[PDB]
Amino acid sequence: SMQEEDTFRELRIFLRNVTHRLAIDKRFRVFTKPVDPDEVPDYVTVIKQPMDLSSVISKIDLHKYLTVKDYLRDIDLICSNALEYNPDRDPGDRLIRHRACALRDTAYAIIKEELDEDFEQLCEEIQESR
Numbered sequence: 280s281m282q283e284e285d286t287f288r289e290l291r292i293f294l295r296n297v298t299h300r301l302a303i304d305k306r307f308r309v310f311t312k313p314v315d316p317d318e319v320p321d322y323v324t325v326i327k328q329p330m331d332l333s334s335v336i337s338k339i340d341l342h343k344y345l346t347v348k349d350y351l352r353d354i355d356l357i358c359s360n361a362l363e364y365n366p367d368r369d370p371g372d373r374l375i376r377h378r379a380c381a382l383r384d385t386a387y388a389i390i391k392e393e394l395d396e397d398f399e400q401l402c403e404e405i406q407e408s409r
C-alpha cells in the first residue's frame with residue numbers, strides 16, 4: 280500500500296541520516312569505503328562478506344533494508360569483520376578494533392535514542408507480511 284511505501288521511505292531517510300553521522304566521524308574513516316586490494320590483498324580472501332558505510336548507503340538506496348534490525352546486521356558485520364581481520368595485540372590492530380566497537384556502539388546508541396520502537400515494529404510487520 281501507499282502507507283507502507285511511505286513507511287519504508289521514512290526508514291531509508293532515517294538510515295541515511297544515521298549512516299551520514301557515522302561516516303563524518305573521524306574515528307570511523309577506515310570504515311567509510313571498501314578496503315583497497317593493493318594495500319590489503321589478503322582481505323578479500325580472509326573476510327567473506329566485506330562491508331563498509333558507502334556500501335551501506337548503496338544498500339539503503341537499493342531498498343535492501345526493510346527494518347532497522349537488518350541495517351544493524353550490516354553495522355555488526357563492519358565490526359565483526361574488523362575484530363576477525365585485526366585480532367593481534369599490535370597497536371594498529373587494537374586501534375581498529377576499538378574504533379569498530381565504537382562504530383557499533385555509536386550506531387546502537389543513536390538508534391536507541393531516535394528510533395521509535397513502534398515505527399520499527401511496523402516495519403517488521405510489513406516485512407513479515409511479504
Ligand SMILES: Cc1cc2ccnc(N[C@@H]3C[C@H]4CC[C@@H](C3)N4C)c2[nH]c1=O
Nearest residue numbers: 309314360361364365367369371372375
Ligand atoms: C577495514 C580495514 C582496513 C585496514 C587498512 C590497513 N590495515 C589494516 N590492518 C592491518 C593488518 C596487519 C598489518 C598492519 C596492521 C593493520 N596489522 C598488524 C586494515 N584492516 C581493516 O580491517
